[PDB]
Design a protein around this ligand. Sequence first.
Ligand SMILES: N#Cc1n[nH]c2ccccc12
Ligand SMILES: [Zn+2]
Length: 140
Amino acid sequence: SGAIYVGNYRVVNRHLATHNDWANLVWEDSSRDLLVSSTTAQGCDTIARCDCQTGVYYCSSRRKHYPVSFSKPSLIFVEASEYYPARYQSHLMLAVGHSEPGDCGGILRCQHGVVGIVSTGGNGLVGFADVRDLLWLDEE
Ligand SMILES: N#Cc1n[nH]c2ccccc12
Ligand SMILES: [Zn+2]
């Protein structure tokens, strides 16, 4: 689990979005595993605007932050999951690291701020849904 809170936006994994998230839907992309909902409270997170390929992510299944090198956001084939069929996920960044299903929502961060959230795992890889292209998260 986990979310990004920026302005009046809550960014979550689309497959973990709650009734409240869907009732307050701003934007969702199935191909990216992202959903953004509106919030009444002002969020404190800053989104990275950059093309960093290194950062640190939080891994709930290890209670650890790990530094990683990750690929630029791409269209990648993602095996079967208990929350998705085998399919192509877009805007996905891969690193070598540990990721189990409950690690979804762990934040990847660089010096510029939040890069994305854990979205995929298995085979010793961790996949992160990029948010840095969603420039609209940064105003109203
Ligand atoms: N987990 C974690 C964090 N590491 N660095 C941060 C900076 C701002 C907010 C949260 C964190
Ligand atoms: Zn950066």
